Design a protein around this ligand. Structure first.
Ligand code: CDL
Ligand code: CDL
Ligand code: MQ9
Ligand code: MQ9
Ligand code: MQ9
Ligand code: 9YF
Ligand code: 9YF
Ligand code: HEM
Ligand code: HEM
Ligand code: 9XX
Ligand code: FES
Ligand code: FES
Lengths: 55, 535, 382, 382, 53
């Protein structure tokens, strides 16, 4: 019974869609920090380069 | 009559108060228009978004360890004992409309806040914006960075979660108990008892929503006031000197573009909060001392401290009837890191001798040793961060966990040296490239000489040309040099009609010569101002 | 070099702006409009472009409003119609909001870069060393305030004010911080050897001499009978089970008196233990610690789960290597030998619980840890 | 009328202070020292007085420190040795702290009033209507920023930016406030007539048709069996008892399942009721409401405790006057008649619970309130 | 007891008596009926950060 419950949880966690956007793997801090530094920070820096000037 | 209303309101304001001169000064203040000077604005905007989302979050968050069975909507966690903090975090995620989005954009804003603070720190350090006039600004900014790191720690520790709880248990509790003379006393004072003391999360909630944000707001006010009144520094350029600010006024251009940049940063953060899942606590059961996970990492801004914990080689000392665990090593390491970061400008000036009032930034290539040291420090920080992530790195990229740990251990003394050497030589070679451009002109396509078969690159001089072909070398002035005729007056006049169809030739000609006149007018104005300053 | 008493009336807007720049130390050079040529259709195209961006921002803001008001939000159980809509609900909120404000920002930037005139205004920077008049006047004001006050002449007042402020600050800081300061070594936890400090005692410390503390397995049952007695036969070679210090008095969670004792057992930091069954073939590789040679019950070894370094549970038990790995900082403890760290930050072995079987064959602790079990601290190893 | 390029070197402190006042528009008139005559002993006495005040501040600060560190603080149960010390522990903290800082402040005030020189400095106030140069230059700068930007010429941008900002603000505000906005009339509370709204339903609402809801007395027992079934004989003429809607399923608080139902019963805003035994002599003065004529059981009347005006309990009961008084705002209801308000802010009678006795004689509600019982609201009386 | 009685009087009764939106404001503020499990946390936020700010 306990093993069946664990199996049910494993299947539910595997087949459950990520609520709140693309689930970056399942690891929170590391994928999330990488996604920040790439997506958000490249977007911000590129927008800053667009708005400002080079000199 | 909106014009009449505006005039009457202005007259009433200038009669009740007298802000005409002050407001004119604020509007006329000139700010350099370099992109790298928006990096601090990114952090400021992320902080503002953090405040706005945090107020919303506090309207729904309940800090407490009071045990409760969920009995909510989330089926996978029903009847499980959890703290009221976790229960209300789950309520924000599920029960409250848009609460999941608000908390996700809050966490993404926290990550962007840390990242933009780091990028701004890199900008100022490498450009030498901390020198004589602004060492105090550097210092308060370093305190601000430390506060941001620890507030993010407390923020993702607020909803009592398995991941955040085990992170707290490790860092806070273990490293606090480790401290030799007062470690256990600090632990008991902070937690009001043993580790799971029933005041920890309320105390962190207070520190995180009121105390640390208040200090950060005061320090950001001081920071912005200092930047405002110690007029913003600028890179060397045509009309830019140590005693002027070349750029755009606050009112017409700078205000508009800063507001638009804030809008776009808010948009990026909202898009991330929507499309990217950040800290899905529901997958993470409520904190229990027995339950664990393999990942067990902090946010990226504390990942370097965690990596220091992992990599430092288990050196414990046992004085007479006592213990000095390995946590104190990392505590002292963090102390040293923060002390050196805060005291760098003073260390820099002690080492070099620079006590001059510096208002013109230095190019990181133009300052090799500082650029090399900054590169070495960034390499060490990245090594520590990836060492903290070594668990997931080993899992996904098939590398032995021991192999990653020892790669980190060896590289934290090897990689810094390699990066220092490479960055120093790279900076000197960038200087050499700049001087090659200065003395030979920009490079272009090759040509075969008429009489003989020599090949010459057909350079383009940037200054007066000698009576013969070779030009008179120019003097380096600390400003970037155009190494591509791309960015000079060459090949830049596409048909100005549209993407799919042209415009009338008369319109195209009018527009193109109008643009030519405008750009040469700008160049002539800058040249005349430069000549006027000394000549 | 005059303040323009009456010329301001006929001064034009450009002249007045130049005058303001002059007064503020700002010289506007090359303030030129973006579209000097009138009537061109490139101007109209750029106008329409920025208008399209702003209208996209507005349409996306309206979309945010409409999706927030009318969308299948609310959690939907697993594998239920509406789960997809719920899953992409929050993404739609964020997409609409971010796209709206981002498009507004893009429109504003395009307006600045295409329509607002271009300027290279240069401001005179008066940084550093305020003029000697201002410096000397400030110094005179402060020095006159100090000396006129007659301080640094009333030695008794100078010292008495210092003493008073110092004493008041001392008292106030001490009264502020003494509420927080607590003695970690106040004997509070009862024990067979009298009340002892918290750090020494865990859930495995016998409250009274000879108390039976079963290695109860923590079934995941939500609330009722969370901890149930355990037997050696339940584990099989190469198996690990997290056990807790359960007492007969700490019966099932049905009552309210219980379910607080059980919650305390579950939440005890130093409570959880891992019971591992060493394979009989590998029992010959076991090396035992001083005073812990008889702790193991046959091939059952009970080691604290709390990592000896910073106290994370060390749950990652690897059989066929007999290595108890901690996930927090990747420290391995050799279970075969006394659970000594053979890798990672840990430097002290995991505390080994003495185990045996009571009447009826249930596993019970045969004592208490011979050392403090959590992570190390200053007052340790003595 | 010159900035004193080199005169500042020989300008004295007084001259520099006067120059600073002149620059700032401040003329310091009669800045005179308090003790022009030197060597007088009145000066020494005043010096010693301010010193004594500062030293009293310091001694009281040290007293605060010593008292806080070493005083018998901590609660003492009652009539216990050390209770007197505890009772004035906190008063001593406050006395020492306040006396210390108050004495420091008194010393500072005395120093200002006795040693710091007296001045009647007068500052030139430049309030109102900044000079025309500043006003016109600011107006020119703002108007140039507006017109040069080319706005109020791009009607499409002017309207599109407004629409975009308005739509984004609408979406953002709605998204901010929709988390809070909850429908008060969502049927959530189950009932014999299907789910109903919380305001309509109370703890006395029969969950299923024919349910028995005993008027259980709330004994003060800490936690176990807090609610106990009740019998009419328990009250005597001119008696009031606070009763709650207890179900057989809501057994004593021993179990964890119970002690949550019981906590819900206790915390129910509309749950508590007051059962009043009308004196048989005065039973003939009773007037009864429409549809509430058979609600009373003999001489027992069960009225909601929640005051009909703002919902405070009306717990005060006056026998031989039969007046249910509410402490919050002094409203009296005539219990003899239907509990109609005969004084105070309340304008609606308290809801009357039907009551009776089941088998064994225990008091049970004979139904539910025929009206909503809490304080009134917009959706009421229909 | 005292302050909760004061809350029950003012914040609950006055808010819930307001004609067009009274009950709606009451439920938005209290997360539900009067003893809603979020009232004191919300007031704590309002009282330590929001209103003092
Ligand atoms: C991740 C990959 C996403 C897929 C996109 C892949 C296409 C990448 C093209 C860039 C490569 C060319 C390059 O190196 O130089 C570009 C640009 C300028 O190079 P330069 O020649 O040396 O500077 C002189 C220019 O004239 C400088 O003049 P300028 O500043 O005025 O140029 C701006 C024009 C031209 O300059 C650009 O910015 C071009 C970038 C356009 C691609 C972004 C839109 C498509 C992806 C959106 C996400 C979905 O800007 C625009 O038209 C609007 C672009 C707004 C910037 C948004 C970038 C961040 C969003 C992408 C990260 C999010 C990933 C989520 C998945 O520098 C950049 O790196 C732009 C940021 C790079 C974005 C990709 C991030 C990786
Ligand atoms: C919080 C975080 C959020 C961000 C906030 C930070 C923003 C800072 C930017 C500073 C901008 C600023 O203050 O401009 C004001 C600026 C004041 O300075 P100013 O006018 O240039 O005066 C001459 C210089 O200040 C003379 O200075 P200087 O150039 O000779 O250099 C001396 C400088 C030396 O440099 C410093 O050390 C400055 C740095 C200050 C250190 C920390 C102070 C700030 C702490 C903030 C904490 C916030 C929490 O000392 C200062 O000026 C210190 C001023 C402190 C103000 C800081 C404001 C924050 O002018 C105005 O007042 C314009 C605004 C007019 C307002 C009235 C409008 C109409 C009235 C309507 C009322 C109601 C209507 C109903 C009918
Ligand atoms: C302390 C420490 C650094 C120990 C060493 C462990 C380590 C990082 C080893 C290197 C990892 C790599 C590069 C493995 C591939 C095999 C290998 C070593 C090849 C030789 C390396 C070499 C010199 C190649 C020459 C060309 C070259 C530079 C190749 C680099 C290729 C790569 C991987 C570039 C990107 C760098 C990168 C992202 C490395 C992983 C780092 C992290 C923290 C990723 C985080 C992350 C993870 C882990 C997810 O699972 C995920 C899932 C869904 C969405 C997002 C993510 C996400 O962001
Ligand atoms: C760092 C510096 C300039 C130091 C000055 C010298 C000095 C005073 C040293 C004394 C202090 C000491 C002892 C320093 C040594 C180690 C150290 C820095 C400790 C403190 C750490 C700290 C609090 C702050 C350092 C922050 C900092 C400047 C980080 C680098 C930021 C920069 C320039 C980033 C490049 C810009 C950019 C486009 C980034 C996005 C592109 C990517 C993916 C870059 C790589 C990358 C990065 C940069 C991540 O941070 C990251 C985090 C989590 C997961 C993955 C990643 C990742 O892949
Ligand atoms: C489900 C749900 C709840 C969703 C909502 C998510 C949530 C909880 C919160 C976020 C929602 C909100 C409210 C989003 C919008 C945030 C917001 C106010 C964005 C404004 C950006 C915007 C709409 C621009 C429109 C385009 C336009 C016409 C721009 C020009 C006019 C404007 C708006 C100018 C703004 C200028 C601006 C950013 C002022 C900031 C004020 C502050 C704090 C500092 C000013 C300042 C700045 C900005 C410096 O850069 C600086 C640099 C060096 C020295 C000193 C300073 C300095 O003092
Ligand atoms: C401005 C923000 C823009 C953000 C872009 C957002 C991306 C949208 C993605 C699509 C919509 C949302 C999907 C939500 C549902 C969902 O989660 O998506 C999974 C997919 O996942 C994957 O595989 C990855 C597929 C590759 C495409 C996505 C990659 C985007 C990355 C690159 C963005 C972050 C930036 C990082 C940069 C890195 C470079 C650093 C230098 C799909 O299921 P599956 O594939 O089966 O997942 C397995 C379970 O089943 C199974 O149990 C489980 O056990 C697992 O095996 C699991 O993988
Ligand atoms: C210059 C000031 C010189 C005085 C330093 C005073 C600190 C040394 C303590 C000396 C007396 C200790 C024995 C008598 C007292 C004793 O037995 O208590 C102990 C703990 O000492 C305490 O009481 C409270 C400690 C007072 C805070 C000290 C703050 C540090 C000082 C050094 C910094 C400020 C001074 C100004 C310098 C900085 C200037 C700034 C530039 C143990 O607690 P426990 O037995 O559990 O009872 C608990 C109750 O105490 C507890 O208040 C209560 O909270 C309960 O929680 C309870 O558990
Ligand atoms: C909450 C964190 C921070 C905020 C809100 C912030 C904001 C800003 C802004 C907007 C500027 C002017 C624009 C620019 O120079 O890019 C600035 C300048 C500066 N910042 Fe910060 N920054 C933060 C963190 C830091 C850190 C970590 C350091 C170190 C630092 C040191 C400086 C210095 C020295 C300057 C002067 C640069 C100059 O004069 O151009 N700041 N800051
Ligand atoms: C100033 C910089 C701040 C940073 C770096 C920061 C960081 C964070 C982070 C990363 C989280 C985790 C969110 C999650 O796990 O979903 C968090 C939670 C939280 N933050 Fe902050 N925050 C900041 C400011 C604030 C402010 C000013 C407030 C209050 C106005 C606030 C209120 C909250 C609350 C209530 C939570 C818990 C909500 C939850 O568990 O989902 N934060 N913070
Ligand atoms: C965090 C800062 C860490 C501060 C440690 C303070 C150590 C105090 C106790 C040392 C001790 O004598 O205990 C016995 C010893 C363990 O056994 C030995 O007698 C031979 C040991 C040979 C290795 C010596 C290495 C010393 C290095 C440190 C001096 C450098 C600190 C920086
Ligand atoms: S927390 Fe277990 S080895 Fe560090
Ligand atoms: S609360 Fe009862 S009369 Fe007002």
């Amino acid at each position: 019974d306990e093993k069946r419950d664990i199996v049910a949880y494993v299947r539910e966690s595997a087949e459950t869609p990520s609520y709140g956007g693309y689930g970056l793997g399942g690891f929170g801090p590391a994928p999330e920090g990488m996604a920040m530094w790439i997506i958000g920070m490249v977007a911000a820096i590129g927008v800053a380069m667009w708005i400002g000037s080079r000199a | 009559d909106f014009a009449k209303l505006a005039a009457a309101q202005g007259d009433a304001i200038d009669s009740r108060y007298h802000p005409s001169a002050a407001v004119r000064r604020q509007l006329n203040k000139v700010f350099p228009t370099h992109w790298s000077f928006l990096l601090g604005e990114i952090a400021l905007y992320s902080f503002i978004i953090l405040l706005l989302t945090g107020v919303w979050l506090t309207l729904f968050f309940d800090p407490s360890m009071a045990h409760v069975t969920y009995d909510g909507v989330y089926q996978p966690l029903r009847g499980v004992q959890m703290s009221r903090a976790y229960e209300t975090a789950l309520d924000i995620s599920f029960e409250v409309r848009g609460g999941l989005f608000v908390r996700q954009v809050h966490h993404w804003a926290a990550l962007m806040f840390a990242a933009s603070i780091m990028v701004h720190l890199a900008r100022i350090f490498f450009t030498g914006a901390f020198r004589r006039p602004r060492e105090a600004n550097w210092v308060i900014g370093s305190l601000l960075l430390i506060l941001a790191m620890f507030e993010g720690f407390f923020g993702y520790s607020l909803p009592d979660d398995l991941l955040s709880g085990t992170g707290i248990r490790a860092a806070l509790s273990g490293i606090t108990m480790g401290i030799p003379v007062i470690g256990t006393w600090m632990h008991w004072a902070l937690f009001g008892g043993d580790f799971p003391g029933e005041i920890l999360i309320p105390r962190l909630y207070a520190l995180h929503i009121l105390l640390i944000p208040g200090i950060i707001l005061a320090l950001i006010g001081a920071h912005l006031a200092l930047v405002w009144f110690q007029k913003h520094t600028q890179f060397p350029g045509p009309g830019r000197t140590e005693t002027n600010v070349v750029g755009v006024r606050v009112m017409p251009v700078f205000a508009v573009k800063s507001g638009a940049f804030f809008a776009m940063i808010t948009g990026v953060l909202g898009l991330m909060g929507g499309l990217l899942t950040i800290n899905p606590i529901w997958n993470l059961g409520p904190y229990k001392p027995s339950q664990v996970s393999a990942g067990s990492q902090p946010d990226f801004y504390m990942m370097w401290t965690d990596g220091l914990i992992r990599l430092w080689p288990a050196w414990e000392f046992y004085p007479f009837g006592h213990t000095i665990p390995q946590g104190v090593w990392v505590a002292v390491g963090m102390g040293l890191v923060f002390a050196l970061l805060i005291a760098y400008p003073f260390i820099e000036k002690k080492v070099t001798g620079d006590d001059a009032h510096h208002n013109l930034l230095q190019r990181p290539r133009d300052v090799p040793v500082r650029t090399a040291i900054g590169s070495m420090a960034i390499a060490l920080y990245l090594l520590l961060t990836f060492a903290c992530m070594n668990d997931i790195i080993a899992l996904k990229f098939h590398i032995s966990l021991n192999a990653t740990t020892w790669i980190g251990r060896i590289g934290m003394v090897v990689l810094p040296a390699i990066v220092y050497f490479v960055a120093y030589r790279w900076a000197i070679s960038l200087q050499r490239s700049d001087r090659e451009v200065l003395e030979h002109g920009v490079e272009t396509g090759i040509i075969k000489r008429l009489p003989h078969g020599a090949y010459v690159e057909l350079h383009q001089p940037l200054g007066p040309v000698d009576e013969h072909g070779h030009p008179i070398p120019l003097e380096y002035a600390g400003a970037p040099l155009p190494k591509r005729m791309n960015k000079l007056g060459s090949g830049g006049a596409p048909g100005t009609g549209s993407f799919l169809f042209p415009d009338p030739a008369v319109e195209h000609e009018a527009l193109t010569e109008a643009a030519h006149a405008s750009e040469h007018k700008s160049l002539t104005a800058l040249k005349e101002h430069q000549d006027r300053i000394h000549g | 070099g005059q303040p323009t008493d009456a010329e301001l009336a006929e001064m034009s807007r450009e002249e007045l702006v130049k005058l303001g720049g002059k007064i503020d130390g700002v010289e506007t050079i090359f303030k030129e409009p973006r579209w000097p040529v009138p009537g061109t259709k490139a101007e109209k195209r750029t106008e329409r472009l920025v208008a399209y961006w702003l209208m996209l921002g507005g349409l996306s803001g309206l979309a945010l409003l409409l999706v927030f008001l009318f969308w299948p939000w609310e959690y939907q159980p697993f594998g239920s119609e509406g789960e997809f809509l719920y899953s992409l609900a929050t993404p739609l909120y964020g997409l609409t909001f971010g796209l709206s404000i981002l498009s507004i920002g893009i429109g504003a930037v395009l307006f600045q870069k295409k329509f607002i005139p271009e300027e290279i205004s240069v401001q005179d920077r008066h940084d550093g060393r305020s003029p000697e008049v201002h410096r000397k006047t400030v110094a005179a004001n402060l020095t006159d305030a100090l000396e006129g006050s007659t301080l640094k002449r009333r030695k008794v007042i100078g010292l008495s004010l210092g003493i008073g402020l110092g004493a008041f600050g001392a008292g106030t800081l001490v009264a502020f911080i003494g509420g927080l300061i607590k003695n970690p070594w106040k004997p509070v936890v009862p024990t067979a050897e009298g009340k002892k400090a918290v750090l020494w005692t865990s859930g495995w410390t016998p409250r009274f001499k000879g108390e039976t503390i079963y290695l109860a397995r923590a079934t995941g049952r939500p609330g009722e009978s969370p901890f149930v007695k355990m037997r050696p036969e339940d584990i099989d070679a190469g198996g690990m089970e997290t056990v807790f210090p359960w007492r007969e008095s700490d019966g099932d969670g049905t009552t309210v008196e219980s379910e607080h004792k059980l919650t305390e057992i579950a939440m005890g930091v130093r409570n959880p233990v891992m019971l591992i069954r060493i394979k009989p073939a590998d029992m010959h590789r076991v090396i035992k610690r001083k005073g812990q040679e008889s702790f193991n019950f046959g091939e059952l070894f009970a080691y604290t789960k709390v990592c000896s370094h910073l106290g994370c549970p060390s749950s990652l038990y690897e059989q066929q290597t007999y290595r108890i790995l901690c996930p927090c900082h990747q420290s391995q403890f050799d279970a075969l030998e006394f659970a000594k760290p053979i890798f990672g930050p840990a430097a002290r072995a995991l505390a080994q619980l003495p185990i045996t079987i009571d009447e009826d064959g249930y596993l019970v602790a045969n004592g208490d840890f011979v050392e403090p079990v959590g992570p190390a601290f200053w007052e340790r190893k003595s």
